[PDB]
Design a protein around this ligand. Structure first.
Ligand SMILES: Nc1ncnc2c1ncn2[C@H]1C[C@H](O)[C@@H](COP(=O)(O)OP(=O)(O)OP(=O)(O)O)O1
Ligand SMILES: Nc1ncnc2c1ncn2[C@H]1C[C@H](O)[C@@H](COP(=O)(O)OP(=O)(O)OP(=O)(O)O)O1
Ligand SMILES: [Mg+2]
Ligand SMILES: [Mg+2]
Length: 327
């Protein structure tokens, strides 16, 4: 039966996006937005009659963790950055804090918008999500992110304990060397699957990343004699996807009077929230179906005599950058 490891490795080379520490361009676009916020803030606070708050920025998201993928045509890069303002949380509404950042970014690119967990600034072919934190020193020693929107009620405006560094560290440290490499490749493969089969409803990147933290297992073989190591990414995805499917739980929804299959995946650090909690029952059901059809293709791919047929089965789920050799 035809193997597909070479094709997976090539697919990986095509989809991977270099992380911040190796991506001049990303750093520059990041540093530009941070620059705009400092410059912007000087204005917003010259109005108020108070000293501009200072912030310490740090890298977040898949570009910090080396799990980033290139977007498909008409998709956007997602530059995630955190800013820790020299402010005490208990003295400020978090939404009001997010307003400062929005207003400081009013003019920059196609402007800024306040989301539930970040301020997002738009630009040609990318966006920057700024997660906004209060200083742990002035806030009694916890790092809290500014949660809530402009239209959000009172009980939905809050400073939620977070641990982005802890999360990144667990992703980096779960494995090492070529084992960790396979883990990162498998997250990327599933992010392209997400981009290909889900609408611009989609299994978040955070979700698949946390899922992998809990459930990914390396697939490699070590020759008993030569101790030569080869990796089997197809098999790694098969076991990982099967394990995710096994952890779906039929969950009754009283309002709708039916159950939906739901996958719950806790963040392995504070606040230990279910990273999929925002997906609806119906989007979860569709997510489970598509995971099952991906699993079936991963199995099909291992029992094809012809490389063409093995790859084509994979391309139907991973999309047209998955290499299909001619028959
Ligand atoms: N639901 C959540 N719960 C807890 N932390 C989150 C959640 N969503 C996002 N975060 C934090 C951790 C993420 O690595 C970071 C950026 O989120 P996001 O950009 O959605 O994921 P990501 O950068 O790993 O994947 P992607 O490659 O798909 O952009 O913010
Ligand atoms: N704890 C977290 N830390 C950092 N980023 C987070 C966290 N939780 C979610 N995010 C990310 C994921 C999203 O890409 C982005 C916006 O969060 P989200 O809660 O989806 O906003 P939202 O409620 O505006 O979404 P929508 O507009 O679709 O309803 O921030
Ligand atoms: Mg991201
Ligand atoms: Mg993001």
């Amino acid at each position: 039966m035809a193997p597909v490891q070479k094709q997976f490795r090539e697919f990986h080379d095509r989809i991977k996006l270099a992380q911040y520490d190796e991506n001049q361009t990303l750093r520059d676009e990041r540093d530009a937005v941070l620059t705009a916020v400092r410059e912007g803030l000087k204005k917003v606070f010259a109005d108020r009659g108070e000293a501009a708050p200072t912030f310490t920025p740090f890298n977040q998201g898949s570009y910090a963790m080396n799990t980033g993928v290139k977007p498909l045509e008409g998709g956007e890069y997602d530059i995630d950055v955190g800013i820790i303002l020299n402010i005490a949380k208990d003295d400020h509404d978090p939404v009001e804090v997010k307003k400062w950042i929005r207003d400081a970014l009013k003019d920059y690119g196609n402007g800024a918008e306040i989301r539930r967990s970040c301020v997002t600034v738009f630009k040609p072919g990318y966006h920057v999500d700024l997660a906004v934190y209060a200083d742990p020193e002035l806030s009694g020693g916890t790092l809290c992110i500014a949660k809530g929107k402009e239209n959000s009620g009172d009980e939905h405006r809050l400073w939620q304990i977070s641990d982005p560094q802890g999360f990144q560290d667990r992703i980096a440290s779960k494995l090492s060397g070529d084992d960790a490499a396979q883990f990162r490749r498998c997250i990327r493969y599933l992010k392209r699957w997400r981009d290909f089969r889900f609408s611009s409803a989609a299994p978040l990147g955070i979700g698949l990343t946390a899922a992998a933290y809990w459930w990914f297992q390396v697939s490699k073989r070590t020759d008993p004699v030569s101790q030569n190591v080869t990796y089997d990414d197809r098999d790694a995805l098969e076991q990982f996807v099967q394990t995710m499917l096994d952890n779906f739980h039929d969950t009754w929804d009283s309002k709708d009077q039916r159950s939906y299959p739901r996958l719950t995946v806790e963040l392995p650090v504070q606040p230990y929230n279910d990273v999929f909690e925002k997906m609806t029952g119906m989007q979860m059901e569709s997510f489970k179906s598509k995971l099952q059809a991906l699993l079936n293709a991963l199995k099909t791919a291992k029992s094809r005599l012809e490389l063409h047929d093995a790859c084509k089965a994979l391309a139907d789920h991973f999309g047209s950058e998955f290499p299909v050799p001619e028959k």
